């Protein structure tokens, strides 16, 4: 991959999680500010998702660790667990809303 195909893949997924986010009508506000894309939880915690994009990985702050993604079976699988970037997304959102956004159907 080069840095224009990542930017491609990675505008294509923070599109995908807002407009997966509005679908819902979720409690959940985001924010884009050049790399970074912040959810923002009624609660006032956060999910912060930012673009390394020399790497060519997507990386996620929870409130307890980091995760790096990379781009694989077109999807963004974690380099350590192997888990699947959205889904992970989903179960983070329920915990720290109480509500249900689905990304991957
Ligand atoms: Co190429
Ligand atoms: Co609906
Ligand atoms: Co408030």
């Given at each position: 991959?080069?840095?224009?195909?990542?930017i491609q893949?990675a505008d294509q997924l923070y599109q995908?999680?807002?407009?997966?986010?509005?679908?819902?009508?979720?409690?959940?506000?985001?924010?884009?500010?050049?790399?970074?894309?912040?959810?923002?939880?009624?609660?006032?915690?956060?999910?912060?998702?930012?673009?390394?994009?020399?790497?060519?990985?997507?990386?996620?702050?929870?409130?307890?660790?980091?995760?790096?993604?990379?781009?694989?079976?077109?999807?963004?699988?974690?380099?350590?667990?192997?888990?699947?970037?959205?889904?992970?997304?989903?179960?983070?959102?329920?915990?720290?809303?109480?509500?249900?956004?689905?990304?991957?159907?």
């Amino acid at each position: 991959m080069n840095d224009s195909e990542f930017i491609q893949l990675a505008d294509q997924l923070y599109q995908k999680i807002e407009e997966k986010i509005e679908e819902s009508g979720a409690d959940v506000d985001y924010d884009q500010n050049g790399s970074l894309l912040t959810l923002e939880f009624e609660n006032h915690t956060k999910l912060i998702i930012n673009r390394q994009q020399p790497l060519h990985q997507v990386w996620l702050a929870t409130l307890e660790n980091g995760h790096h993604y990379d781009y694989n079976n077109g999807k963004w699988i974690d380099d350590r667990s192997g888990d699947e970037f959205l889904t992970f997304l989903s179960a983070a959102i329920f915990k720290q809303s109480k509500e249900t956004v689905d990304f991957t159907e």
